[model samples]
Target: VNSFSGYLKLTDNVYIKNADIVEEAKKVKPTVVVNAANVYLKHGGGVAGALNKATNNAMQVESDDYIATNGPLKVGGSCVLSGHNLAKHCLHVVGPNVNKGEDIQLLKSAYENFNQHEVLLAPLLSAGIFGADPIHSLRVCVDTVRTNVYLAVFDKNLYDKLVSSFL
Candidate 1:
């Protein structure tokens, strides 16, 4: 297992530290980019709904090509299943504390999609609510995404683990 996690510069003004996957992808141009992020609308709501609303507004207001998933399922809500239709490619993954089985499936799908494309973007520590097991998640992601993985993590412990895995 090999990993590299760090902060990324999204734009001139907006800098995302944890999501190195998305940040790296933003560097290279692509036809479609799949976001596994859930929409966090207000409080107690799901990430999908927030993502959908935000994406819609961004497209409408700025006329950008960013898309998002739909609905707000629970922590383990089926974002992959539902968000698949929201855009050309949908990332249906959750954070930690939900279900390992569901995360595995979503990771598999993300790997498959990444294989077909030249670039793949994703977050390193996003699995369930509390965040998935760092080592386990990176291993699974590496096995699936293979050479085309862009891992992103915030915690130094997890980042160090990721680096050690890859080395």
Candidate 2:
């Protein structure tokens, strides 16, 4: 969405990019792509929507089936499901909503959930309608990830903030 079209290499295995995450994930073919999911795991809007459409809505059906079988997911909870056109697998992490008084620990846990994968791609979790601070979420991403990580950031201001703060 924004006009920013560049990336910053944070480390040998970590990157922050102003790019289409789904396309990039397809290109890089990571082990898994992280989903900034809600407790219901509905792929309705934001990154979830993009992922759902990219997967031909099979992602939505899989998520709906997961909820139907296992009950609703908790904040900071995670589950892995078969991936579609994007990657081989998808890690669904329920991000905390600040409007509900949820804290960053849950968000940190969401990032921490990625430890099981070797290489992954993710959006800036909770920085959307969930209302977590952009810089705070970015810090959690940088601090908690243990695998090869690619962060797909869409907002120009946030991208600028990332470059200014991390570079």
Candidate 3:
């Protein structure tokens, strides 16, 4: 995927991106890739689903573990699983179906609490499936936290345009 673009730092630690989450994960082979899951870890779809599908469904093992004790997972809290395929570990977070102005705080917690890796492949939360306007999400996430962030995007055209925009 030579068409794959590069990163533009939005802050000292945060960087916006344009690429497939699993694609990039396979490329970088990061230690951990956060699932961005829901309470029950259904992972039927969204970025979380992609991960579960990509890993040959290894996540379900951990998904069941969390379900047994701590279901209805928190936005900030995540469950860890031994990595499969591209990642060495998986930390799954439950981003909500809607945001009431506090999800960003929870989003920040998802990144802030991570101490195991130098890079995190976070989904572009609150967009598409969540009905968030794309550009607005870029703003919300850019301002939400200052971590070493790599956003997950699947479209090439959108990727090209965003890669060129500096301000």
Candidate 2: clashing pairs of residues:
none
lDDT of 1 by residue, 1-167 (tens): 21233434332211223443333333532233444444332212233333445454332222112222434544333233222223344454444343333444454443454555444345543442434565665655565553344444545665665565552
TM-score of each: 0.46, 0.89, 0.75
For model 1 the local lDDT of residue 73 reads 41
lDDT of 2: 0.82
For model 3, how does the per-residue alpha-carbon lDDT over 20-97 read when each residue is reduced to its tens digit?
A: 888888887777676767667787877877778887877777677768876567766667777688677777765445
Candidates sorted by lDDT, descending order? 2, 3, 1
| RMSD for each of the candidates | 9.2, 4.0, 4.1
lDDT digits (tens) for residues 32-128 of candidate 2: 8898888898888888898889889999998888999999888988999987888789899888988788886888888888878877778888887
Clashes in candidate 1: how many? Answer: 14
Clash count list over all predictions: 14, 0, 1
For residue 3, model 1's alpha carbon misses the true position, in angstroms, by: 18
Give the worst 10-residue stretch by lDDT in candidate 2: 1-10
Per-model C-alpha lDDT, please?
0.41, 0.82, 0.65
